[model samples]
Target: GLSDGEWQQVLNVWGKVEADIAGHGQEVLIRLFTGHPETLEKFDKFKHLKTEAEMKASEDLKKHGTVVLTALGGILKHKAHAEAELKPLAQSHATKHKIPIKYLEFISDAIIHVLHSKHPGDFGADAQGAMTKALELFRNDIAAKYKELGFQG
Candidate 1:
């Protein structure tokens, strides 16, 4: 439950990087692999990379990273219709990709990790909290979909 102010803070700060989501987005996934190397297994192209330097230099990583953030950016605008909008992704992830929920959680964490570190001034206490809540809400909706699809953890 984000207060109106929190939602404003999230959208305001998010817009700062929205234009450069490819750059920022790839770094988010890079950060995710940095902290959790095993998650890279999901990406066949990236899984073969042996070191952080390799990942940072991968153009494929950048492309897919852009795909992720671009999708999420669209979803950000549909906060009022969360369950309806999110259900498609939830169904796809549950049925098609079929990974556990924690990877989504990992990406959620990586988003803030990138956001606050990248934009120190914009992501102060209140804004950071709001961002966390907003991502958590997204995760919660996805999790509910998992349950509905019988994809329990």
Candidate 2:
């Protein structure tokens, strides 16, 4: 476990890391900021299985940065999913977990990063549609979850 001072240092590092990741796409930087393993676990659930092509791709030319960027993508996807369950449960969860509900803004930034990481000249078609649909589904799920919990929007 990180000590308080260590955690503070981690946040400082995270600030810069987040800035660098800003353009990649909507992803998990905020959840990572929360430093909660359970949240990370939640994120993992949203990831698509690495396709056969991805599995067969050689790592020789791999860009590690892209891997991290992909992680951000996964994180953003999870946030979209969580938002459904988060809004209404916000109050109760906030009370129970001691976190403010406004953290959604932090997660919302994933959309920006999604735009950032996308290959240039690639946004006009499926890429754009996929990301947008993803955002909608993710956000709607969050709303639904909140409603189910009797929480306010």
Q: Could you tell me every candidate's TM-score relative to the true structure? A: 0.51, 0.29
Name the 10 consecutive residues with the lowest summed lDDT in model 2. 53-62
Cα lDDT of model 2 by residue, 43-64, tens digit: 4533432433332242421343
Total clashes in model 2, counting residue pairs 3 or more apart in sequence or in different chains: 15
Candidate 2: which stretches are off by over 4 Å? Answer: 1-118
What is the Å distance of residue 137 in model 1 from its true position? Answer: 17
* Backbone Cα, N, C clashes tallied per candidate: 0, 15
User: What does candidate 1's lDDT look like per residue over 1-153, in tens digits?
Assistant: 444566677778779768788898788998998898789887787766778888888888888888998888777757735544666788789999986779988999999999999999989999999999999988887887789789973
* Off by more than 4 A, model 1: 80-153
